[PDB]
Design an enzyme around this catalytic site. Structure first.
Site, PDB file in Angstrom:
ATOM      1  N   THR C  96       0.820  -1.212   0.000  1.00  9.64           N
ATOM      2  CA  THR C  96       0.000   0.000   0.000  1.00  9.64           C
ATOM      3  C   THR C  96       0.879   1.299   0.000  1.00  9.64           C
ATOM      4  OG1 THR C  96      -0.071  -0.014   2.509  1.00  9.64           O
ATOM      5  CG2 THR C  96      -1.948  -0.864   1.383  1.00  9.64           C
ATOM      6  N   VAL C 104     -13.115   0.556   2.411  1.00  5.69           N
ATOM      7  CA  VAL C 104     -12.757  -0.903   2.371  1.00  5.69           C
ATOM      8  C   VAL C 104     -11.290  -1.075   2.787  1.00  5.69           C
ATOM      9  CG1 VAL C 104     -12.396  -0.727  -0.256  1.00  5.69           C
ATOM     10  CG2 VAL C 104     -12.517  -2.955   0.837  1.00  5.69           C
ATOM     11  N   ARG C 107      -7.348  -5.928   3.882  1.00  3.63           N
ATOM     12  CA  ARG C 107      -7.764  -7.251   4.326  1.00  3.63           C
ATOM     13  C   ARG C 107      -8.817  -7.937   3.404  1.00  3.63           C
ATOM     14  NH1 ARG C 107     -11.421  -6.620   9.588  1.00  3.63           N
ATOM     15  NH2 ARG C 107     -12.746  -6.442   7.756  1.00  3.63           N
ATOM     16  N   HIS C 217      -0.319   3.120   6.258  1.00  2.79           N
ATOM     17  CA  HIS C 217      -0.227   2.228   7.429  1.00  2.79           C
ATOM     18  C   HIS C 217       0.933   1.227   7.192  1.00  2.79           C
ATOM     19  CE1 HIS C 217      -2.078  -1.397   9.857  1.00  2.79           C
ATOM     20  NE2 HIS C 217      -1.186  -0.718  10.548  1.00  2.79           N
ATOM     21  N   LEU C 219       2.562  -2.225   8.375  1.00  2.00           N
ATOM     22  CA  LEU C 219       2.448  -3.476   9.119  1.00  2.00           C
ATOM     23  C   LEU C 219       3.783  -4.123   9.295  1.00  2.00           C
ATOM     24  CD1 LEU C 219      -0.866  -4.683   7.346  1.00  2.00           C
ATOM     25  CD2 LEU C 219      -0.668  -4.449   9.750  1.00  2.00           C
ATOM     26  N   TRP C 227      -2.649 -10.021  11.660  1.00  2.00           N
ATOM     27  CA  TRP C 227      -3.433  -9.552  10.538  1.00  2.00           C
ATOM     28  C   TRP C 227      -3.665 -10.605   9.478  1.00  2.00           C
ATOM     29  CZ3 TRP C 227      -2.649  -8.933   5.084  1.00  2.00           C
ATOM     30  CH2 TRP C 227      -3.398  -7.945   4.484  1.00  2.00           C
ATOM     31  N   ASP C 294      12.257 -16.963  -0.594  1.00  2.00           N
ATOM     32  CA  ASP C 294      12.177 -17.195   0.862  1.00  2.00           C
ATOM     33  C   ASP C 294      13.525 -17.454   1.558  1.00  2.00           C
ATOM     34  OD1 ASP C 294      11.255 -20.283   2.391  1.00  2.00           O
ATOM     35  OD2 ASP C 294      11.347 -18.413   3.514  1.00  2.00           O
TER      36      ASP C 294
END
EC number: 2.3.1.48
Lengths: 217, 75, 424, 164, 82, 230
Positions: C96, C104, C107, C217, C219, C227, C294
């Site tokens: 974001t 909305v 999530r 925001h 996270l 979340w 990963d």
């Protein structure tokens, strides 16, 4: 002209480009030779050089082992040498390098060795452009018989295939390097062919003078 | 990962030669020395940049990584 | 293609968007491709992962001339020699920027796109599949590819036009060509599902410099861990059968304090551990899957370069995820996942109006690089990430972005609170 | 694992004069009765280039340790500027609380301190002779770094393989 | 003073990369000296414990358990109380 | 410096080696001069056949996704009139340049009613020669080009103001365009076309030297490799 005929000619230009690739390097094999020879003639008159330059190189970080430096210290001499004006068998874009080691007494023999190197490309068959070589016979350390691939008892083992994976990463497994065995030979061994012949020379004299430096940073 | 292996491994040998001549190592141990250094230095750099930020500098200086040695109980 | 009794991605995506508000979006997916097994089999086992297939899907949601979300996800199918089949979703990243806003949460964007993927029939990745390597001259006529040089490419063009009158061949579509040039497989549409995630700072990145914006925001750690755990928990009571497994594990944390974070979540059979972890007191080789980019899968690779990998314990692998700050996990990092049967059976074969399916992995990259290469230090990055893809799809694909009106009211009939409330 | 442990710390007086005391309020816990003494020490780093420039601001001895949650307060006298390198003084450094049981340090807390003048012309032109009354300290009371250390807690119950 | 003094474990690019993973934006060029001096202390500390366990277990070869068991001395560091 | 004498017979040899490295470089240059010159006529022979093919270069710039990040897809209607790309190495025209230095050429077929048909050549140069202490930056001279008449709201030459917030945005979007790069020069960070160095390097190290390799990557029989090659 029609695209049908214009394509046939454009392909011959892509093939003339790769024939220019050999000519502009044949001119390298001709025109550099008197500053190749002069350079060599100064390293035959310096007593020892390579046992000072090589360990300091920022890219030598990628290639040669903490344990192996006791064997490459014994290098007296290293020379790069071309074949294509002396032999039909080799391209002007192929090359060889020569080493001469004084050895460790009762451990690792005194030896002169030459490895040859040759370039591959997409040519009719569009296989990935790579550098390649032939395996060379070398006298391995006696201290290294636990990791010398030829004395491994069983290469299936959780210890045997790790001792093989160590052993293939030595400077001696680089002499066995070919470029053609994914995950099964010396890693980045092509870029070690370039380092001794070309990527060393831009800094080696900085490095020789740096080991003569007594001042501190 | 972040450190280049083979000069670290030789640093490990020269520092150790002076405490034991002809010492060996396991490959697992030498890489552990390396992965501990990456993890201690990554942590100490996050600390050096908080010293800089607290100082009202963008820029880190050799002051800041020593002060970060002190902040983590020196030793 | 575009069957009327089948769900478009617009009929999913418009059902969580704010009511009568209109949006634009990007969806794309690479062609289904040949892989080795996603986890290493144990020598003791009766089964063989006889074929594994993967691809990646990319997504961006646009509001008011500008981008406001991106998401990135891999999907896998494993065909067994006798145990039939299983699909897996793995999530790579999402981001974001704060330069458009609406009633909305991302999530619910994350959930509804996961339902669009959950509704894909796994046979949409199996009917024709891109091989690892290919043969282009083995039988006649020979094929123009990246196994012919540029010289031999233009010599075969000048041969096809001169001998055959056209560059085009109809013949090389016939079965003794495709027998080799393509894999093709078939399985049941009702199959076991897995979902996988690895919650870390570097997964929260697709818009460079975007975190500079005080309206974003961010996270991290424990809230990012929760979340996504409420997102799998919002599947478990609506999108899964009530016999399904769900795991959590966190580096260096006490197995009852991990069990204690799960008392937030609704679904019962939430459990401490990992979906891939096959055995107790086991070597990390048979238990840590070989996922792309990963840190755990990369560490299985550094445990191959050391060649310790047949000897390294799972406890010891998890103690190394706590101890090695160099992996850059940050505090309350987590491995989470599900395994079991979705509450309904899948059906889609998604259209061209659900998803762009570009004819090359370089092209697919470039469509991403158009958004995820720009510098989100400014609102003007989000404006270009949309004006620049727009004019791309028209002058390189004759195509529009997809567009749709939302449906979702600030009112409920079965829940105790609407979604579109102050937390948006 | 450790018998004694730190529940937290708060800093009462900041930002403040350099020449102000360092007021702390520390909260800690003892699971069960120990034998030896516990000892807190608080120190200031006089330079990054030498450890011989550290100052002890205060130390605190407690024997026996009260079992359960327990709290201690400080008001420690500030560091001597005449012993501090003059070029270092108008700069960033750290303050460090040691906690030690029976002479083994089981925890350290460090905090970054920035020293800058409260007058804009001494921010702009730092003098050769330092204006000690105009240096403001700023302690990072939001970001302690808590280095913990494992130790023996009773030697008649636990045997240390390699004591120094 | 001699070249042995000048055996290095970390290049200028790798020190910037470590720095980058500590979230740094900008660096004084004297950090390329200083980080090498701070690692030379970290290792000779870890090494003097680990060689002590290696000698003492009667071994020539240093083991990964002797390294992780020397690394207890540096403690662990936590940005808070709880 | 001033720490060491070099009077021994092997120290004379070492000083010789320390100058021979600059002799090696100076014939490495004479051989690179031969390389530039030998390519040059086959550059002519090659592009004679390219000049007959339809859409060749629009296809090369549809495979070249590094260039489709530096160039904004809004320009594509205008870059789609590219009929000819050339690149030439300047050391061959004169001593005044080095073998590092290059000049880019385009012809554009134009669009009736907005954009003129036009040929345009642009010189480039890298800094920091031997013994220099400047930055080794890539740099260019600014060179005119006729901009589309429908851009005159973002074109720097025809926007009435650069100083308002709007005029900064109009200037930014103007300088982000293909036509911004012809004014670009390598000396004005945050006031000229971003990545106008990496663009200028793509042409002379990728796009033009391997134009056939990328044309040959769009040519395919198969719906799932159009275009990719590794």
């Amino acid at each position: 002209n029609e695209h049908a005929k214009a394509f046939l000619g454009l392909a011959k230009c892509e093939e003339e480009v790769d024939a220019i690739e050999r000519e502009v390097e044949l001119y390298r094999l001709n025109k550099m030779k008197p500053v190749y020879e002069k350079r060599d003639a100064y390293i035959d008159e310096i007593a020892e050089f390579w046992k000072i330059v090589l360990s300091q190189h920022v890219s030598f970080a990628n290639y040669i082992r903490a344990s192996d430096f006791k064997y490459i210290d014994t290098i007296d001499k290293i020379k790069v040498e071309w074949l294509a004006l002396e032999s039909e068998m080799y391209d002007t874009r192929d090359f060889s390098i020569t080493f001469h080691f004084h050895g460790i007494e009762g451990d690792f023999k005194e030896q002169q060795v030459t490895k040859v190197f040759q370039i591959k490309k997409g040519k009719d068959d569009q296989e990935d452009g790579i550098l390649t070589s032939e395996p060379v016979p070398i006298e391995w350390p006696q201290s290294y018989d636990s990791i010398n691939p030829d004395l491994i008892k069983d290469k299936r083992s959780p210890e045997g295939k790790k001792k093989y994976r160590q052993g293939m990463k030595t400077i001696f497994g680089w002499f066995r390097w070919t470029g053609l065995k994914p995950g099964k030979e010396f890693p980045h061994g092509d870029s070690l062919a370039s380092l001794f012949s070309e990527e060393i020379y831009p800094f080696c004299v900085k490095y020789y003078a740096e080991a003569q430096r007594d001042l501190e940073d | 990962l972040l450190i280049r292996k083979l000069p670290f491994q030789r640093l490990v040998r020269e520092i150790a030669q002076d405490f034991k001549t002809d010492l060996r190592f396991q490959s697992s141990a030498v890489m552990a020395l390396q992965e501990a250094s990456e993890a201690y230095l990554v942590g100490l750099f996050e600390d050096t940049n908080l010293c800089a930020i607290h100082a009202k500098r963008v820029t880190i200086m050799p002051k800041d990584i020593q002060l970060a040695r002190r902040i983590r109980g020196e030793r | 293609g575009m069957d009327p009794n089948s769900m478009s991605l617009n009929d999913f995506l418009s059902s969580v968007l704010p009511v009568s508000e209109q949006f634009e979006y990007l969806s794309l997916q690479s062609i289904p491709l040949e892989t080795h097994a996603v986890v290493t089999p144990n020598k003791d086992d009766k089964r063989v992962p006889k074929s594994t297939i993967k691809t990646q899907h990319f997504f961006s949601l646009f509001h008011q001339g500008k981008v406001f979300f991106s998401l990135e996800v891999y999907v896998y199918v494993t065909l067994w020699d006798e145990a039939d089949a299983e699909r897996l979703i793995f999530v790579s990243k999402a981001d974001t920027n704060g330069y458009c806003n609406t009633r909305v949460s991302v999530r619910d964007i994350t959930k509804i796109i996961l339902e669009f993927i959950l509704s894909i029939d796994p046979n949409y990745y199996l009917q024709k599949v891109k091989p690892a390597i290919r043969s282009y001259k083995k039988i006649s006529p020979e094929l123009i590819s990246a196994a012919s040089t540029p010289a031999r490419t233009l010599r075969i063009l000048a041969r096809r036009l001169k001998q055959s009158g056209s560059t085009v061949l109809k013949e090389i579509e016939s079965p003794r060509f495709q027998q080799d040039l393509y894999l093709s497989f078939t399985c049941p549409r009702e199959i076991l599902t897995k979902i996988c995630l690895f919650t870390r700072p570097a997964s929260q990145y697709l818009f460079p410099d975007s975190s500079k914006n005080s309206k974003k925001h961010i996270l991290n750690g424990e809230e990012l861990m929760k979340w996504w755990g409420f997102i799998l928990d919002r599947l478990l009571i609506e999108c899964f059968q009530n016999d399904t497994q769900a795991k959590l594990r966190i580096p260096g944390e006490d197995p009852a304090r991990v069990r204690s974070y799960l008392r937030g979540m609704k679904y019962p059979l939430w459990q401490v551990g990992d979906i891939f972890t096959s055995k107790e007191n086991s070597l990390a080789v048979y238990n840590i899957p070989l996922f792309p980019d990963d840190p755990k899968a990369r560490f299985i690779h550094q445990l191959a370069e050391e060649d310790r990998l047949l000897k390294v314990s799972l406890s010891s692998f998890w103690i190394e995820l706590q101890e090695r700050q160099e992996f850059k996990l940050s505090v309350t990092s987590s491995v989470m996942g599900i395994s079991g049967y979705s509450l309904a059976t899948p059906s889609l074969f998604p259209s061209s109006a659900d998803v762009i399916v570009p004819k090359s992995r370089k092209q697919f990259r470039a469509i991403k690089k158009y958004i995820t290469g720009e510098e989100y230090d400014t609102e003007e990055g989000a404006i270009e990430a949309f004006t620049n893809i727009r004019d791309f799809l028209l002058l390189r694909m004759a195509t529009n972005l997809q567009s749709l009106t939302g449906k979702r009211e600030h009112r409920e009939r079965n829940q105790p609170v609407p979604a579109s409330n102050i937390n948006t | 694992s450790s018998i004694v442990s730190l529940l937290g710390i708060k800093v009462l007086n900041n930002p403040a004069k350099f020449t102000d005391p360092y007021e702390f309020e520390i909260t800690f816990e003892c699971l069960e009765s120990l034998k030896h003494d516990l000892e807190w020490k608080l120190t200031y780093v006089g330079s990054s280039r030498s450890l011989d420039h550290d100052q002890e601001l205060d130390s605190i001895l407690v024997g026996p340790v009260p079992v359960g949650v327990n709290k201690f307060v400080f008001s420690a006298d500030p560091p001597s500027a005449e012993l501090i390198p003059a070029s270092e003084l108008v700069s960033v450094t750290v303050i460090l609380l040691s906690c030690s049981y029976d002479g083994r340090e089981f925890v350290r807390v460090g905090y970054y301190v920035n020293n800058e003048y409260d007058e804009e012309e001494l921010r702009e032109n730092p003098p050769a002779k330092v204006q000690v009354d105009h240096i403001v300290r700023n302690i990072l009371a939001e970001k302690p770094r808590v280095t913990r250390f494992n130790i023996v807690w009773d030697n008649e119950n636990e045997g240390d393989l390699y004591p120094p | 003073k001699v070249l042995r003094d000048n055996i290095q474990g970390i290049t200028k690019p790798a020190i910037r990369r470590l720095a980058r993973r500590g979230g740094v934006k900008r660096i004084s060029g004297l950090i390329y000296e200083e980080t090498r001096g701070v690692l030379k202390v970290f290792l000779e500390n870890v090494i003097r414990d680990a060689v002590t366990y290696t000698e003492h277990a009667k071994r020539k070869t240093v083991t990964a358990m002797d390294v992780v068991y020397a690394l207890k001395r540096q403690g662990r560091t936590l940005y808070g109380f709880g």
